[PDB]
Every structure is written in structure tokens, then in C-alpha cells.
Amino acid sequence: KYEYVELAKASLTSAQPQHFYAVVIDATFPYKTNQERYICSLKIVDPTLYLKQDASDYATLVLYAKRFEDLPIIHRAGDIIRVHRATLRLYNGQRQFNANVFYSSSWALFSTDKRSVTQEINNQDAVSDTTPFSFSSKHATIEKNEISILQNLRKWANQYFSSYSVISSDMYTALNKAQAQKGDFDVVAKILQVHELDEYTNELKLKDASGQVFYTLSLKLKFPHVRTGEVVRIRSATYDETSTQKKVLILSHYSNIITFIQSSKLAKELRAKIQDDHSVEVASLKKNVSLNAVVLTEVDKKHAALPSTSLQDLFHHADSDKELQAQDTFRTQFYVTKIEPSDVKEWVKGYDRKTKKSSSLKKGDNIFQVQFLVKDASTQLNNNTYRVLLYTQDGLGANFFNVKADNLHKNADARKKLEDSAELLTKFNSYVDAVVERRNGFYLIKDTKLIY
């Protein structure tokens, strides 16, 4: 039987192991300190300790372990953690709870929202509202009397996050003032874009309330929950003074990227206030070489929720994988290495609806017949290039270039705009975000259009 105490009521004198339920509002990633020690530092809150008189008040929790796997990975703020056998002491004025997981202490994480982060990523349903989505040791036990504690704390957590910022202005620094910091700092920003730099790394394009844009590397394995349009808190970032071409934040092994529970007032306001910025892209288009990525296209709103499929799966597994075989419409990202036919003037051909044949626009029903040769992160090292078609005879991708089909041999205006788009598409660091439809072994672009 375990007796759970509230943060503010825990004993500072009795150095005896105490147990409690609390809401996590901040946490480092579990990190190693030497050869046999791992640590995770987090800030916790509850009905008796959550607000200084305005800024958010809190207690600290430090978990010590001998293995990485024995520590909790906090992907989201607002979830609940349960700790057993923690020793409380005062550390520089704050109530610090310490727990040696490598000995007799244990922890368990409970989802405040319907699903846990991982469950949201894998589209899984929670076993029950009383099941921990993660915990230390081989087992975890929740008694009947704990249910009310958990249900009441969740209700309180949502009230807290919906009526308070929780992560107050004193817990992070404005991006446009980052360069003035002597060391590391925290940030709260919206993810404007997630660029797949390579096999193991994502590049996040961030923008906070100050309007400044910054880029940062985010390992795919470490932070698999990063999503465009979402707000996150970054624990421990540093300003990169060696980056001249663009504003870059450097993260450390202990750094963490944390999202917010649905009820978060802060995340809701920032999600709406912070709007997409393309200033970096527009400026880079004036340089011969852009170290900044530029996504040239935008997919139709109805596909915004559709997951993306790599070129590796699209061309190498699409005829063998069960899941990919049952699908005919996919979303993918890639960069164009070359566009055929070479002569931009031949991009538009005359099409005969009856004989299913096309000819040089020296005659016919005008349509686009463009063949892009692409490549991506998943196929970066191989010796291949992949064909992606823009054959608009049936309407698919008819407005891709924002130029209606016309005889490019006669219409100088259209030819010029297409030629400019050609150079942009084949330019280094230019990428395409598009939806495709598989037909007779080929993928045709559709419901996709240039935004530059």
C-alpha cells in the first residue's frame, strides 16, 4: 500500500521515502554523466504547488539510474508522473525530490490526454485511462484508491494548462535575443516546417512570438513527435555563432523538445498568432547557392493530414509491401535533379483524345507532358534517379506551374514563367512536397502546385 502526498505538503525534515502524483511541465532528456550514471531532471506541479504569485511555481525531480532505459522520456508537457520512494530536500530554495531508480525508487507516466504521444504517432488506442504508458521496473501496480487521484489530477491538469501559460515568460528566451545569451537557454516556438535532412536527421524551422526564424537539427529517433504547425518548448539550446548563412540553434544530448497537452492555452494562442514565414525562402532565391531549404510546392488542404511515403518505398517496395499495395494515392517529398524533355518549349504537347497520342506543339489539344527525375533522403546514396510524371491530359496536376497549358513556341509569357520555374526546381536545396497517383506503374503528380 502506498500513501501519496501533495508536493507542497511533503516533508522536508523526514528524509523518508515519500510517494506522489504530479504533472510534468518540463524535463531534460535522459542523459549519461559518466560510465555508470544516467540522469533526467524535470519540473513538477500539483494542486498545492503550481504558481508563484503569477509566474509558474514548481518542485524539481531528479531521477538517477544505471541504465538509459530506466528513465522517463518526456515528449509532452502536461502528462502525469507517479513516483515511489523519493527523498525530499531543499536545494537553493526549491523543493527537490530525488529518486535513485537504480535502487528502490520507481516512476510511472500517465497520459493526461486520451492518447500518449507514442500512441498518437502510431495511431494506437490507450488500453485504459488507468494504464501507465511507460514505467520503470518490470511491473507497475495501480490500486483502486489511486484512480480518483489520477482522474482528479488530470481534470486539474487541463484546468491548469487551459487557464495558465504554465511555461511563463521567465522560462524561455525570445529568439531575436538569443545571440545576447552567455550560455544555453530555452525557447517556445511553432514548428513551421520539418525538413528531412538525411537518413537520421530532421531540420526544424522554428518561429516564436518574437517573429524570428531559426533552424535546428532534430534526430528522428530522439524526437519522433515533431510535427509541422505544432508548438513546442525546447529545453536547452545555444546560439550558433559559426552559422552565417542562417540562424541556427545547437542542441545537446540532454536537450529536449516538448509538445503540449491539447488544453494548453499557450500552445493554442501561439499556434494561431505565429504565422508562416517565407522571407528566408524568398531571399535565398536571389543567391546562386542557398544553404537554406526551400519547399517550392504546397499540397491541397484535403491531403494536409495524409502521411508521406519515401521514394525508397515508392519505387522499391510499392510492389511488395502489403500496406503500400492497397494505396493508389501517396504524398512524398523530393528534389528534382533533371526535367525532361530538356527543351522547356516541349513541356506542353498537343494531345489527341481519341488516339491517345501526343505531338510537338507544332499541333494539338494542349496538355503538360513533363517528366521529373527525382531523388530524396531515403535514396540519397544510391546510384538512382526516379521518374515522377506531370501528365495533365486528364486534369491531374493541370495547375502545378500556375500556368495553364499553351503553345510554348508562341506564348512567350508562358514559356518564360516555365523556364524560370525549371531553374528553381533543379536548383540545389529546392524541394517538392506533392501528392501522386499511381497508374500503370508510374506516379503522376496531382492536387499540387508551386507557391513561388
Binding site: 552565417t244 541556427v248 545537446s252 515508392l314 535533379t337 533533371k338 510524371l389 501528365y391 486528364d394 540545389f428
Partner: protein
Amino acid sequence: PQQQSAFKQLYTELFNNEGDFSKVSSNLKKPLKCYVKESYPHFLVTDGYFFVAPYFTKEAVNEFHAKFPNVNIVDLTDKVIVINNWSLELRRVNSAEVFTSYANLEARLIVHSFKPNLQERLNPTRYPVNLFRDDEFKTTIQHFRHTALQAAINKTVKGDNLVDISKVADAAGKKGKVDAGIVKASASKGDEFSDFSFKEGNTATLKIADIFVQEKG
């Protein structure tokens, strides 16, 4: 604007000049004063911002063990060294095995001569990060590869072999294999792209383990 990291500027100019070390600015070929972060199992030195792995020639270590007796190299951790004679080469490697590289490409700092300064050498510096993990530098290497890829494809792909429109305009009773969209990027030998024009520098170097045995069997 101004590049604070000497290594970043050096390595970036090497890649932007097709691995030709003679094309890199001469005002950058001056003695390198760098702090030693690690000495074993990996010898890593920093320039105040990033860390790189120096590759010592057999001549460099013998000359070292002569002008500086008993002062072991594998114990230079947390001490500074001054590389007077060095060169930069571009090498094709397996990034999955070499962490000081990226995209199977590595820029090596060949060391010919270096002297240790144990004179309480200090310098408050930010935590050194792997240059081959830096955002901008990785991007520079991607530009390098993209340039080589594009030149090879524009030389290999010709004749405008466009998919016949009929194959996708009457696909009611037509089935096809997606691999029909795969096109070779160059005249290679294996499955990896290797059509580069920079001549892969050679130069013999010592394995960090041999220098450990030469000092402590």
C-alpha cells in the same frame, strides 16, 4: 559574415573547391593552434567551436618523439598542440563507421608536424561539436554531392525517353511495375553513386591504435 570557426571555414572551402587544397585561400594555411579534447580511443582537437580528427603521418610522429622525448601523444588530452605543417585531403569513406564524416565523404586534416604547449594553456570555449554534424556544413557537403549528381545525370540521361502518354492515359486495363520509373544516375559499377571529379587524395596515415602501442605495448 565572418566565420569564427577556423575548421569550418577551412573544410567548407575545401569542398567548395572540389577537394583541391591548392585552391583554398593561402591566408588560411597558417599554423593551427588547437585544444585537444580527446586522445584515445579517438584523437580529437577543437578550434574553439568544432572538433576534428587529425591524421598524423609516420614522419610526423617520429619527428615528434624526437624533439619531444617521453611526452606521449595518446596522453595529450586537455592540452594544446600547434600544427605547423598540415594539408587537407578529401576521402571516400563509410560514414556508418566513421563519425567524423558525412554522406560517405570526409575532409581529412593531414598533420606533418605538431608541437605541444603544456604551458597552462587555457581558453573559455563553448562545447565543441562534431563539424560533420553541423547544419551548414552538412548542407555544404550536400551541395557538393548535388552538383556532382546533376552533372553526371545530365551527361548520362539523354534522348528524352519520356513515358508514352498512352501508358498512363488509358490505364483502365493496364498494370505496371513501379521499378520501371528507376533511372541510373551515372556510369557506375555498384549501387552507390561515385561519379565525382575531385581526385581522391591518398597519403598514408597511422591508426590511432598503432601510436598507442608504439608508446605503451
